[PDB]
């Protein structure tokens, strides 16, 4: 499993590097107050 995730990541990091624009739509949707709380 974590080995699986690990294998994924070796690929996925390339997806992000290579599809920047979609990486951002994917992930950069943070609500600012949540981030502030998680960063205490």
């Amino acid at each position: 499993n974590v080995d699986f995730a690990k294998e994924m990541t070796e690929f996925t990091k390339y997806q992000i590097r290579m599809q920047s624009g979609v990486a951002m739509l994917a992930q950069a949707n943070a609500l600012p107050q949540l981030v502030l709380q998680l960063l205490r």
Binding site: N1, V2, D3, F4, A5, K6, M8, T9, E10, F11, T12, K13, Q15, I16, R17, Q19, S20, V22, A23, M24, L25, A26, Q27, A28, N29, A30, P32, L34, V35, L36, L38, L39, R40
Partner: protein, 119 residues
């Protein structure tokens, strides 16, 4: 190093995602550092606090996933986060497991960073 929480209000949406990784990696590093010391009362308190934060952050990052426009990046991300989340709640999770999570979070954070400097 500057207090992370203080950087939110000068952070782009992408810098906010990285700050969350930075924090998750720092907490995960601490939990690994004290994993063997958990027979001390305080060290076990600290350890669980830190696994909880790593969980809370990783579960936040999953909840921010846009599956509509995120496409396959979204789906893979969701898949990696779910494995992390599922490991982190294991009763019998091991030091090495946490190390590999740490390795993943760092590889992913560096990706995010590469995207940052292209922007």
């Amino acid at each position: 190093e500057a207090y992370f929480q203080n950087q939110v209000e000068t952070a782009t949406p992408l810098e906010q995602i990285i700050l969350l990784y930075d924090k998750a990696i720092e907490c995960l590093e601490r939990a690994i550092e004290i994993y063997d010391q958990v027979n001390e009362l305080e060290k076990r308190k600290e350890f669980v606090e830190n696994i909880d934060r790593v969980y809370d952050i990783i579960s936040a990052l999953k909840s921010f996933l846009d599956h509509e426009k995120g496409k396959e990046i979204a789906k893979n991300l969701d898949t990696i986060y779910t494995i992390i989340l599922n490991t982190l709640v294991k009763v019998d999770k091991t030091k090495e497991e946490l190390q590999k999570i740490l390795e993943i979070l760092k590889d992913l954070r560096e990706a995010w960073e590469e995207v940052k400097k292209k922007v």
